[PDB]
Structures are given as C-alpha cells and as structure tokens.
Amino acid sequence: TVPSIVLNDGNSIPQLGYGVFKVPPADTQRAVEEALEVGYRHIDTAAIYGNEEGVGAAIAASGIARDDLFITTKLWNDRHDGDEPAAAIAESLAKLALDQVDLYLVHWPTPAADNYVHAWEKMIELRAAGLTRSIGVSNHLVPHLERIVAATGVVPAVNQIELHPAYQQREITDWAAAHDVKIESWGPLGQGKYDLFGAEPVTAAAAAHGKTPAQAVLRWHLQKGFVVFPKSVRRERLEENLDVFDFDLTDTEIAAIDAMDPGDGSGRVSAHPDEVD
Numbered sequence: 076t077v078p079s080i081v082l083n084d085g086n087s088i089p090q091l092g093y094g095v096f097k098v099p100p101a102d103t104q105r106a107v108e109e110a111l112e113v114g115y116r117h118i119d120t121a122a123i124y125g126n127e128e129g130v131g132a133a134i135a136a137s138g139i140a141r142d143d144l145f146i147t148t149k150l151w152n153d154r155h156d157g158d159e160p161a162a163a164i165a166e167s168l169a170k171l172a173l174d175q176v177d178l179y180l181v182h183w184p185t186p187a188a189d190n191y192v193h194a195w196e197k198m199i200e201l202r203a204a205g206l207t208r209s210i211g212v213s214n215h216l217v218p219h220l221e222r223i224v225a226a227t228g229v230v231p232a233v234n235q236i237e238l239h240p241a242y243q244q245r246e247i248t249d250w251a252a253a254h255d256v257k258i259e260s261w262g263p264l265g266q267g268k269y270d271l272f273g274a275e276p277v278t279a280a281a282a283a284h285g286k287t288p289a290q291a292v293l294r295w296h297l298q299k300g301f302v303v304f305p306k307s308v309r310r311e312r313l314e315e316n317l318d319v320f321d322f323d324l325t326d327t328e329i330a331a332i333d334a335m336d337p338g339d340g341s342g343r344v345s346a347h348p349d350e351v352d
C-alpha cells in the first residue's frame with residue numbers, strides 16, 4: 076500500500092515510486108498512465124530525461140487528484156549559475172503542466188565548476204517562492220553536504236544516490252541518518268549492469284519468502300529506510316515491483332545482502348560525482 080515517510084521539512088513522500096529514466100519521451104505518457112493505473116503515486120523524472128511532457132500529460136489524463144501525487148524533478152548541470160535555477164524550474168513546471176512540484180533536486184554537484192553552494196542558495200529561493208514544496212540534492216558527497224549546510228543553514232530533505240547491494244555508499248547514508256536527511260536509492264536494482272538476481276544472498280531471501288529476487292532487493296532497500304523507484308517498461312514488473320509490503324526479510328538475511336558491498340567502491344555501476352561535469 077506504500078507507506079509514506081516524513082521529511083525534515085514536514086512533507087511526506089511515498090516510499091516506493093516509479094522512475095522514468097530511460098523511458099523514451101514518446102512512450103512516456105503510456106508508461107506513466109499504466110504506472111498510475113497499476114497503483115504508483117510517486118514519479119521521478121528529470122529535465123534531462125526529456126520527458127516531463129509525458130509525465131504531465133499522463134497525470135492530467137489520469138483522474139487522480141494532485142494531492143495524492145508526488146512529483147519530483149531535477150535541476151540540470153548547466154543551470155547552476157546566476158538565476159538559471161529559476162528559469163530551469165519554470166520550464167519544468169510548464170512541461171509538467173503543474174503549479175508546483177513536490178520535490179526539486181540539484182541533479183549533480185559538478186564540483187569542478189565549484190557552483191553547488193550557489194545552486195543550493197537559489198534552491199532555497201524557489202521553495203520560498205512556492206515553486207516546489209521541498210528541496211534536496213542528488214549525488215552529493217559528505218563534503219558537499221557539510222558545505223551547503225554550513226553555508227545556508229538549510230538541510231536538504233533528501234539525497235538521491237546510486238545505491239544497491241554491491242555499492243552502498245555507507246558514509247553518505249550514515250551522515251544522512253545523523254542529519255535527518257532521507258536517502259533515495261537510484262539504480263536500486265543495479266541498473267541491470269550485473270548479476271544481482273543471481274546473487275546467492277538474494278536467491279536465498281527470495282525462495283525463503285516465495286518472492287522474486289527483484290522483490291527481495293526492494294524489500295531490502297525498503298527495510299533499510301530508503302525511498303526507491305525502480306524503472307520498468309513492463310506491466311508485469313510494475314505489478315511485481317509494487318507488491319513488496321507483504322513479507323519482511325530477516326536480520327540475518329539483511330546482513331547477507333549488506334555483505335555484498337566489497338568496501339573498495341568496486342561495486343559501482345554508474346558515474347561518480349567527481350567525474351560529472
């Protein structure tokens with residue numbers, strides 16, 4: 076039924092949602108219509124995904140009240156400077172055809188450009204302007220975090236990062252936990268970049284509960300306190316991935332999955348912030 080988690084700002088976010096990364100813009104409307112139909116209420120898009128349009132149409136097409144929906148969009152890398160943030164969100168808003176998004180994020184820190192503090196400053200402006208209910212960042216390291224916070228005194232609501240069994244970024248989640256910041260896992264199912272489902276601590280928890288391996292992972296994230304939003308273009312999967320409030324892995328089972336993280340950062344499948352310009 077998807078539980079909702081309380082953010083540091085007093086806003087609630089549905090623990091499981093649907094991501095649109097890699098869904099072609101042209102198929103984006105159907106893709107989202109289905110997800111809404113199936114039962115999903117939290118959509119994760121990005122200006123860079125080029126599909127805010129489909130997302131908006133779908134939402135419009137569906138009969139759901141805005142209140143029951145949670146839209147999240149993101150601020151692209153080339154828009155951190157000056158008042159580009161205000162221009163950026165406004166265009167997203169027009170694409171999505173909404174009055175306001177639920178959450179807005181700084182897509183990447185782009186540390187070489189040294190403009191993330193500035194972008195965060197502006198972010199705080201958009202929230203006060205009512206353009207977005209909450210603000211958070213994505214792909215920010217602990218140093219990035221400490222700085223933006225020390226600089227503004229405004230803690231981000233979330234931090235969306237690459238997170239899965241083989242690469243957990245514990246230093247970040249740990250920090251996030253002490254700072255009342257919620258973690259959003261991206262690429263929660265390894266983005267299909269490695270045999271996650273064949274993983275034995277994975278296969279073991281699956282058969283033990285009669286769930287699929289994909290479902291075992293999600294439940295892992297979920298029990299860890301993470302917000303997840305897997306992507307799939309297949310109805311079956313939307314349904315499968317949505318049915319995970321059933322079981323409950325065991326402490327030991329959770330331990331077994333956790334141990335999949337080598338600790339040398341070798342399980343990473345995507346880009347490291349220090350490489351994204």
Ligand SMILES: NC(=O)C1=CN([C@@H]2O[C@H](COP(=O)(O)OP(=O)(O)OC[C@H]3O[C@@H](n4cnc5c(N)ncnc54)[C@H](OP(=O)(O)O)[C@@H]3O)[C@@H](O)[C@H]2O)C=CC1
Pocket residue numbers: 093094095096097119120182213214235236260261262263264265266267289290304305306307308309312315316
């Ligand atoms: N803020 C950021 O920097 C980023 C955020 N994200 C967000 O996180 C989302 C999720 O990560 P994403 O990169 O999409 O990777 P995911 O880890 O969620 O994996 C998606 C892939 O796994 C498949 N999939 C989904 N469910 C299942 C299942 N039960 N069994 C088998 N395959 C399955 C999909 O195939 P198929 O669709 O064909 O079924 C697709 O190939 C993105 O869509 C986006 O919203 C992603 C990247 C970066």
